[PDB]
Write a protein that binds this DNA or RNA. Structure first.
Ligand SMILES: [Ca+2]
Ligand SMILES: [Mn+2]
Ligand SMILES: [Mn+2]
Length: 430
DNA sequence: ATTATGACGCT
DNA sequence: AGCGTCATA
């Protein structure tokens, strides 16, 4: 009872850009705004692979991973923007730089954890305490939450979406105890006021719209974010968790979308996150290991303690290229030329990184895939990274992989390489 | 022949 | 250290 921790100590948000690469291209090219459009890389093979899709195009059934020729079958008027190509490969610099724009704005409000190119977690606990004492016990107006959904509301004793949104918000605010500066629900609510402000600043200063989730931890914040996209934010309270989880497929929770989630379902004979509450912590630890068991036991009750890490910059800087089907690299000269292309982009990104961020990578990781191997990576070897020099980096990468060549004929490369990957790691301040 | 990434956990 | 898992545009 009185000693049962409820995982309500923190206010955590997850902010995630709507259709991000698409918005980046739409900002640049006004002709693409408010249209079914997608971002594609390469073109020769089946029109190129789609990697981002506007909400107008999703309405036609267009998705990520789709070939553009196939997408055009669903949506003949689909507009396309192509990822830049440099040194013979897709180059994602425009999107990385747009990401920095957004991350720097978010960082004005709080410490952030960069979680991907288009999203960050925010620990708003301190900021909330500040805003609360500023408010002086003043109630929170619905006007301060113009894009916020309260998950699970309205409930109990209008047929429009915005009307439903306002109805739930009214019920929520009607119920709040705004005179208790330690109420978790009030704290979340103030968190949501701050995220409205964060999201308004992002849109004002970049043109980009985003969604957000506000809860007590990262997993719930991430889940919440997706509940009402695009261009909206969702508050998931501790109290909303039982109903939310009662019909929530296990695979929807972050880290459970893969093999572990599949095993939870198979071994326990369940489908929904809520069904996990009926197992003891020891039971879950027996099936899924000590760490996962404890994590599952708390997570299904809406509790998780993973901190928002203070990290705005990526820990690694990498360059990779697949060489699929018949384009697999079969000659030493071929392997060396592409190692050089990768190494040249890597040097460019590393040099910019060193100037912007006062750090230097110290380790070069080289990874390849060989034709026929089921796995995404066949081999991963490291060597020292002592100078930002593309020719040296590619020569070194060749050295650490050159013995992988089955061929007695040195000029030939067998088995042919279906992937090359160069990654700079182990940064030190400089 | 989705591709190009990026973080973290295991042994 | 090298491998595997899970994730996102
Ligand atoms: Ca997104
Ligand atoms: Mn995202
Ligand atoms: Mn996505």
């Amino acid at each position: 009872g009185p000693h049962m921790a409820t995982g309500q100590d923190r206010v955590v948000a997850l902010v995630d850009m709507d259709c991000f690469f698409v918005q980046v291209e739409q900002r640049q090219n006004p002709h693409l705004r408010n249209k079914p459009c997608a971002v594609v890389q390469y073109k020769s093979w089946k029109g190129g692979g789609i990697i981002a899709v506007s909400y107008e195009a999703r309405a036609f059934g267009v998705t990520r991973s789709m070939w553009a020729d196939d997408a055009k079958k669903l949506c003949p008027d689909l507009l396309l923007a192509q990822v830049r190509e440099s040194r013979g490969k897709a180059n994602l610099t425009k999107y990385r730089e747009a990401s920095v724009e957004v991350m720097e704005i978010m960082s004005r409000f709080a410490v952030i954890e960069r979680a991907s190119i288009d999203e960050a977690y925010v620990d708003l606990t301190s900021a909330v305490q500040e805003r609360l004492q500023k408010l002086q016990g003043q109630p929170i107006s619905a006007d301060l939450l113009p894009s916020t959904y309260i998950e699970g509301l309205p409930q109990g004793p209008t047929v429009q979406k915005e009307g439903m949104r306002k109805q739930g918000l009214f019920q929520w605010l009607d119920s709040l105890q705004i005179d208790n500066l330690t109420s978790p629900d009030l704290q979340l609510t103030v968190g949501a006021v701050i995220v409205e402000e964060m999201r308004a600043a992002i849109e004002r200063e970049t043109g980009f719209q985003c969604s957000a989730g506000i809860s007590h931890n990262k997993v719930l914040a991430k889940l919440a974010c997706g509940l009402n996209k695009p261009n909206r934010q969702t508050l998931v309270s501790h109290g909303s968790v039982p109903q939310l989880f009662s019909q929530m497929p296990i695979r929807k929770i972050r880290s459970l979308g893969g093999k572990l989630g599949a095993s939870v379902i198979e071994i326990l004979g369940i489908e929904y996150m809520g069904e996990l509450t009926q197992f003891t912590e020891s039971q879950l630890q027996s099936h899924f290991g000590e760490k996962n068991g404890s994590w599952l036991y708390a997570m299904c009750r809406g509790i998780e303690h993973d901190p928002v890490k203070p990290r705005q910059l990526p820990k690694t800087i990498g360059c990779s290229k697949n060489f699929p089907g018949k384009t697999a690299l079969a000659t030493r000269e071929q392997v060396q030329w592409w190692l050089l292309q990768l190494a040249q982009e890597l040097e460019e990104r590393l040099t910019k990184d060193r100037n912007d961020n006062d750090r230097v990578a110290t380790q070069l990781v080289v990874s390849i895939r060989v034709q026929g191997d089921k796995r995404l990576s066949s081999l991963r070897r490291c060597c020292a990274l002592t100078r930002y020099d593309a020719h040296k980096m590619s020569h070194d990468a060749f050295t650490v992989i050159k013995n992988c060549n089955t061929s007695g004929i040195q000029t030939e490369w067998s088995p042919p390489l279906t992937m090359l990957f160069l990654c700079a790691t182990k940064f030190s301040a400089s």
